[model samples]
Target: LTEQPNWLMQRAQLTPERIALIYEDQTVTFAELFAASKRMAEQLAAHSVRKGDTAAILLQNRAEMVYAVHACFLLGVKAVLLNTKLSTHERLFQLEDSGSGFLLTDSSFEKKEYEHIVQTIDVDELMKEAAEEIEIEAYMQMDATATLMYTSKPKGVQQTFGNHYFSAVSSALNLGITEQDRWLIALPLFHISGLSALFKSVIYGMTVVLHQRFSVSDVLHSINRHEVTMISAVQTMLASLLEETNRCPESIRCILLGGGPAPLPLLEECREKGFPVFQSYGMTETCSQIVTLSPEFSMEKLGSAGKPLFSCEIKIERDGQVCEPYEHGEIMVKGPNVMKSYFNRESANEASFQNGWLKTGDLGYLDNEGFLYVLDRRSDLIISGGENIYPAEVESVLLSHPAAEAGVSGAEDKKGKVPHAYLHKPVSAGELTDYCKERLAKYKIPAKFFVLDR
Candidate 1:
């Protein structure tokens, strides 16, 4: 467990002809995938990106993003995944904070101005350069930092190779894998949910069917076309698919759901359609999912995130004391899959970890039978369409406006929960909308505005 051959490199040799990635009409074998990534790694090395250097990856979910990820891994560079939905200022802050030496992005974001200290390289252009021979890192040291995924807290969670490896292993044990399996990835590659799926593919020698983006038509088409056995999703994606069709593919075996507790009606609908829904609970700090409810328990222990994965442990705590079963408290998670620290943030690291347990700021409770029932994300954090929106993050953007006083809260929405703003001072809806557009991500913007009498 301390050290092992790089999973991708090993898998490439072991299953040279195995289908590795399928995007649109393209299908890449394991050998072909590695060859492409190896060339990309050599090109990156030519640009002076070496082992241990931080590279910010800002691109949409596409084949190039997958190659870029493997290229960084092959070169032993740490990846800082930037959400494409973030405003320029938000992305810039992450790039600077992570101390990224290079930013690997595509043409869509090519024209944006970034600080000169960080080199911005477009993936399309980077791949166009002739690749000279360079030695790829052969082995992965489990304890080394693999990626830095930023959360709404505005800090990067330092995920190690060991963290990713264990996360995949635990998930496989929870939901058994098969050699014939094909997993569909519709989520953004920048997100932990999608990123972990990539790791699982290499580690398990399974196939991955990638989608450019989540469209109900595209997802269902890929599922039937690829014989996709498993797919990871949030409530919104599943709900959208349900609206389009009521039947699950015969090949579909696992629909891993996360981001929050699902509505009972949705789970009931899945049951009626024979779609196996495995509810899960996790965060960026926990890699992908630490706890998952199997399909059998989907209704038996409804609303539960299920027990911790084989390698993880969960506890409910309040005021530094462990809570009794069924007692509401903050969720505490500890495991090899848990992140070790926050990049460049000492106070955040100190505040987040208590002994070995990571204080998941989320509110939840364990029942007498040990099933986890998540109450809410930390501090009124809203999960809209699987995207996390912190009220404070939105309120900060609101306060920046001319409004004298502002407050943000989670408001009901058909998809999930959306942000609602309350302003003490008078401000037109159009005026506030334009102000937020410049400073916040589209998902973080308030859905509705309310005027306070004051």
Candidate 2:
């Protein structure tokens, strides 16, 4: 319940020689990581990046991204990381909305249009500078905006703010930190999942095995080599990893899965294989996994995302009424990890909060046992003849077939606006339909099925 401390400074004091980060052949000890961040901080100071100034980062998931994040904390500048996979228009909208005056990018991302409006700095060039050897000052208070994250929706991009150094460190310490813990960085740094790992490692004075991207082989190898104990993964990534190999690594104590509802089959396979799979739920608004299934309840609440973490609260609301057990409703949350508000939009801020809780826009129910079961994303629900249908339920049944790999949303029926589906696999449309006919009720089954080459 204490106020959070600056993570980088804490790491320097606790374990300066401990290895803090690893990316292929390169490694940075706690001392070295702090030194690099301090040098970058000095560079930012030279560029007039004072407190509260937003600096946009246009780099890939490399060591430089880690350094840039910590450097921002040291200098009191906000780090706004851009997703490299986003379209030019997406990037432009985020930069403009964030009101960023400076851009930090790699040589490969040096776009011609970047030179016009924002001052740019090359990450590679910044790394080449010698360490200043001066004392590295840390910002202790959680007053400044540490990061600005842009979420792209069908409507437009919305910015979410994060506290720079204090939040993650505090959460990690409260959760319990161990020197032996080796956290995995498989997710993108632009994502809260990956950014949380960076802060957790620094705060716990633990090691982080960083990967430019997630790969089954790389994940397996790194776990074995580094004795990695914890990792954050999505449901798709976990499914692929499970399919790749049957053997589980001895060092891995937990595999945190998030990014929407997970398929039941994937959870079953992990349980059978003795893999410690823990379901977690959170968003960019929350720094990372605000609610997680603890190790003790991993099997007891096998399919549930379990309860909210320390300092977080969850409730359900339906039709202007707070619902009781087993009733589906919007899941609302409130916590310190939640962002202050959506940037530059008063209406969005108003819509996001209901009675001071964030409306998650997810549909789910709490069982009699107090376990939360996420049915489906609210947006993905299909309504036909006033009956609601969960696409995931149908998709789960389709995946049960021998040939199904992936499935997606399709157009609705012209007359009734009923749900339709497009399944991607080697199986024929008739075959899948026949399979569904035996398992589903008349209305639960899709009206039409289209086969696509996977």
Candidate 3:
């Protein structure tokens, strides 16, 4: 491995015409991408976006947004990756939290009056770059800041380049990258899942097919059209794609499914469809997914999040003692793939990470066979009539029912709280109550069920 921080340049040197991106009507190669980034860097520099300055990027998964990210690395500036789904109030919290001086966005999104907070720079309205400074020259310091991806466990947790780098390498070591690999990005660019894909694809000299948003038809069409091999999607997205059409092209290989303990029915559907769906468990803290279940072991280790990646170490704890196998407790992870620290929030840093391990605040257990089974986000636990009810336990049972599809949540009721079920196909409350009763305790059964419209 070269002691180089410039990954784009390294990739360009290795494969200049390796298709870097396939967006809409255009397909850009690594060499073309590298040159475009150089030009973007000069434009940013001309607009006074210099080293040490922070620029928050609030854009879709567009070609220009890709150029802006590469340019940030070239200029040694930190890029704050913001979620497009966030409300203005939520967006401002991150913009201020990351100390962003400039907001680099596209013509498509909003430019609210937050001049006091940040100066918005529209990549479209500009004429041209200071093309004079068009050159591929950017130093890499591995420890320096790259992108601040915000996470909310209540407050925002910011991730760095150091976090993203180890995560990419750890994933690569396990899921070997091939020369013709292309990952489809139907998820938002603001998310760690999408951003991690972009980072890993570039590092492995693979291609990325960018999408503006998630559409069932679009995802399936892209996979067959672009011959996309690997993709990262939520359990819901995977289920929807199967609904759209299970006739996936033979060119496709892996579907890295995240979001939660995948419903058994969805996994079975993917298997029946010849889609190699791997259930993954991770968050912004671990930089996308640290624990993943390959399809080969997907059934034998049903519901298991699999073992941690090559660089990750996982342990289960309750009341501070490390629990034995099959014992339920909090899932803890310690690895270079984990976040360096919780940005500038010292109090959060002190509380969130402890004794070299980051407390995931998620409840789970490892079986005697040594696979991680994530139970639930401990924060989402519901208490009813003084009995603790994990939504995942309730949700998992609900998904086992024939017509059930994807989502589950808890709502506070007169007594305390209860599970509210959402399904892809309609099922009466009476029907669900019977289905859940067979698998769950009386208290764990959902108080109500609702059919979700597609």
Candidate 4:
């Protein structure tokens, strides 16, 4: 209950020759990946990174990022995953809030001078530096925080090793893991969906086919080349991939889809093409997927997020009363997979948890058979291409502009939903957009800025 063997290190020892990662043309075995991660751990030690220290990782979804992440686990250092899609302000806030002194980044990102950051280690440079070997942790404590991930509210969710370990175990219980299972990871490593795949890869000793970005052709090629047995995708990625092909590769047995509910048409098309789509319901706080609709119920349940994982429990509540089946209420979940608490947010922690259950802030209902169907994301949350953008967060950025009074709302888009900003006072749309570019992430910026006559 307290600790377990270091997952990656143990996996390497168990299957040294097995292919652990496939990035483009390069394939890395478990032994090679472990060696790289150990080397990274050595380099980080030389740079003053040590056990229990918070290190911010600003990296793309690549092989190097994978090594860096495991390096943190090896040294027992807590990693703060910086979402590369966020603006400098948004990223720096989390870095400062988390008290991360060192930043593990690469040259591909725009260079920025940070006031709070003590050291910035470039991935290429850090890899080449002289190694100062340090003792890696043999056993990872279950209660020790593994990651600090910030959502749209800028609240950093603390995911413990136990949270990740149980999440992977529970997911495997539902989907059933195979020796030949190879998962395609096109999602960003900073998010729970992508990072969980990395954890599962080492925990289950499964090979992960990594991609820097999601592209239909690239995904298809990787699936064919690697014989990928499973894929972790969002709705938009699956929709686009489905558009290009009428059939899925025989090797793909499951497509775990998350990041908001999937449109009915997308699910129907996947059924038509015999793509095994498992619609999942989860967020950053839940590690990845808490509830998933298995392929067996994919057609019969249709639109349902399905049942909770084997180790998790789901309930619908309103005014502290558990609702009857088919009643609309807030979705409440309880499990070890759920985060212990939001990092350093006492007020949030107080409101989020009731007894042992965590209030999801999402509305959904369970059918008579106890199948969960998501009604919506958090109120006023815009999910664009699987990225959550809270309207309040966008409005706060707009309000910062001199003499600006703003409101933001979600507008339906072809891809999903996007933020639309409305200004009470007259302001130049171009000027406001320019101002937002410096403060907000690209996706959070309003798709249309309108000047209200009020």
Candidate 5:
């Protein structure tokens, strides 16, 4: 824990000649990234943005979002990344709740949904200004509150603060990074996955290949063209990529897989296909992944999320006590990467963190080998006759079947309150019931099975 350094300034000092960002046709070197971001910072400062102020961003995935994020860092202002897919009411709620006075967006999102909420600034225009001559200061002092991310909820959105650029850079360097590494940005920028990549690229002085969104052909082409060495993908994205091409590029050494629990079939397929798939677990609360399975344990640990990273601590608590090995409980985590608190919501913050540990609403247990096996999201758990049934366990077993491709939860039993399953395959109910009857206990087996046409 040494004092943190300004990420952009450090990159400008160390690797001004390196290519920092690569989009479809535009490229920004380390020096240009800093200079462009600095120009935007001056523009934002003229608009009265200061340290601790939040800037709401309502835009699609593009290079402008990248510039805006870095500009916020240069100006010591926080960026609130709003999902472009959110409804007008939903977007407005988050903008107001986060206390963002500035709204940055592109032409795609200039519709009436966000026209009256806050002061709207065009990211494209800002980038164009960066190219022109503008009198701007060297650099302002850096601070925390680099970004704000809103979590999806039924009633409304919940805001969470992101780490400073240095905090994110330190975490990536602690994991292991190199200048030659090329990170593939396949996930949306509004999500933590893409934003974390921006910080890492600056920290390692590496190159980033950005995709507007995840596309099978685009991903394969980018990997081949840029010799991308690292990529972060969800299970669904991996499945699509595997289905699109059988050949795995040698340059791709690691695939950081996140999102919910993965289908075992997909994991096995990647293993057999020579894809280095490492399952990880984290949320907006922890910035990105606090726990990740290293490549060394890819074959050994299989579905486990390995151990905690260097800057984090993990534990399981149940019935007001810490659980022993092979016991399931609410997963708890604490670290510097964790957010300060849910923005402005005292009750939500108090309910989310216990003592000091952030109570992750996920259920899992640590195996005897010291590996963490996440069962499922606590909200997705099914209870049948007082016996806890993990849907992932049943789904994994079903996926192992020869004909199974996908499966999901179904309605509860009308009389017995037992769980049911809906699978996408040609298997019959009798065959599936018998299949599970051989492995699972009578109480654990799903009472009913609904096979759908694939």
Candidate 6:
């Protein structure tokens, strides 16, 4: 089970009748999903998409996105997921950086947006070109590159078949799964939280409820309709669900919460809303969900993101030395769930991806009880007049306010950078300021409020 002897085809044999995907308007079993992907593999093979070819996908969360990704990996083509929010320049940069020659897009780009010399092919149109007869790839090495996903730089994270295999096993062990478990996908497919779930579906034989985008009502309805037991959501998305309804459906089990820290108010509302919230801490580099705070320890470890998954290791470092209890420092992690390298960024790789540990430039510390409390990303840390401030610290307090929604990042000030907050709606600068007056330190208080249009 650790090695993927042809990721898709293997699953077809084992669970052909099991429901694999449940989209908005369609539901496909393993047999149906695999057959379509097998056909796609043939079509792609006819178009000369063979092993070692790198391609890009400009698609939203849908069946085609899933099929295209699986089809690419079926033939050993390394697929790079492009962020729909990425600017033309950024898009061109990644295309060139990964040496990707083809862009499989459902999105349209103007001629003016083209800056790189890559073939742009419409994925849906390509699928319509018809199936061809060809020998499906029987097996691929465990370490063979399966995908390339960009975290923050031009060079993308290179993930292997072994990485996915190990990651799935470890995640399943930490967050136990069952055949009855149906995972709901509201997050964008471009992100690891969503993409990894897609791969996990075939491996674990669970049904995935895919949403094109986050619609609070739609999400609630789908959960009941599809009998979704598991869901991947961010802090804001969770808050939205809590805002709309007083309780989650009885069938729902775990809500894998990530993105950043969940304010005490949001986590506090979980009981009232009947959610089994597990606040997780992870990034693209690791594929980690590195740390997770389960409901059992939710109150005990208030503000803490609990322990690392059984397969991962987490340590806090201050000035190159492991810190003591209640200490604040850089959080470092290493595990099978992590990616060893990024594509074509050897020099860049040398910077963060060390021997076994990734020096994650975020700040946190392990308490005396050995629980992890993620403070904030190093870059987003603010300092004014030599007084340090963490935005999450500010937002954690602000998120409690009735008017506040989501906020982050530090902005430059006269003395130094200051906390620049973003309020969702039904909010303003004065309300945010009044809410944090007694809660946060003078320096920690936000310097300004904004509406992040992006």
Model 2 pairs in collision: none
Model 2 agreement with the true structure over 203-270: per-residue lDDT tens digits: 66778899989898899989889889888898778888788777668888778778754556766678
Model 6, range 1-454, lDDT digits (tens) per residue? 4454776678889989999999988999999988888787788787777788998888888798898888887777889988889887898888888888778776454533552568777777788887667776678667777888987756688887777777788788888989899999988899889999987898898899999999999999999899999999987788788888868889888999987666666777897677999888888887648788888788778888888888789998877788999888899998877887878777877988656898888998899988999888898777787877887687678766765566565666665676777654577677767778888878777777777664
Q: Which lDDT tens digits does candidate 1 get at residues 1-454?
A: 6888999999998998899899989999889889999999999999999888999998888888989999998999999999999898898899888999999987788545763758888889988898689989999899999999999849998999999999999999989989989999888989999999999999999999998788998888888889899999988899997888868878989999987666667888998888898888899999999998887778788768899999899999989899999887889999999999998889988998999999988888899989998766577867788876767657756765656475655656755778888774567889888888897899878888887764
* Per-residue C-alpha lDDT of model 5 across residues 1-454, encoded as one tens digit per residue: 3334567778889989899888998888989888778778777776677766778887777777777887876666767888878787888888888888889887777555666778888776655553433343334333245677887752222322234443455456545676678999977889888878888787678899998889888889889888899998988788888898775678888888897545657766777778887778888777788788875676667668878877678899996699999899999988767776776777877787888898888899998877788888788888877778888778777776777787776438665467687773366778888888886777768777777764
Cα lDDT tens digits for candidate 4, 1-454 = 7999999989999999898999987999999999999999999998888887999888888899999999999988999999888889887788889989889888887655653465788989988899767888989999999999998958999999999999999999998998989999998989898899999999999999999999899889889888999999887788888888869888999999886556556677888899898888988999989999887787788668889999899999979999999877789999999999999999999999999999999877899999998766567556788876767657766865765765655666755777788774467878888988997889888888776654
lDDT values for all models: 0.87, 0.75, 0.81, 0.86, 0.76, 0.82
TM-scores for candidates 1 onward, in order: 0.84, 0.88, 0.89, 0.83, 0.88, 0.89
**For each candidate, C-alpha RMSD in Å?**
9.2, 3.3, 3.4, 9.6, 3.4, 3.4
Q: What is the lDDT of candidate 3?
A: 0.81
TM-score of model 5 relative to the true fold? 0.88
* Higher-TM-score candidate of 2 and 6: 6
TM-score of structure candidate 1: 0.84
Residue 338 CA error for candidate 1 (Å)?
0.3
How well does candidate 4 match the true structure, expressed as C-alpha RMSD? 9.6
295, model 2: CA deviation in Å? 5.6
Candidate with the larger lDDT of 2 and 6: 6
Candidate 5 yields a Cα-based lDDT of 0.76
Task: Give candidate 2's root-mean-square deviation (CA, Å).
Answer: 3.3
Worst 10 residues of 6 by lDDT: 107-116
Model 3: pairs clashing at backbone N, Cα or C within 3 Å:
none
- Report residue 186 deviation for candidate 2 (angstroms): 2.2
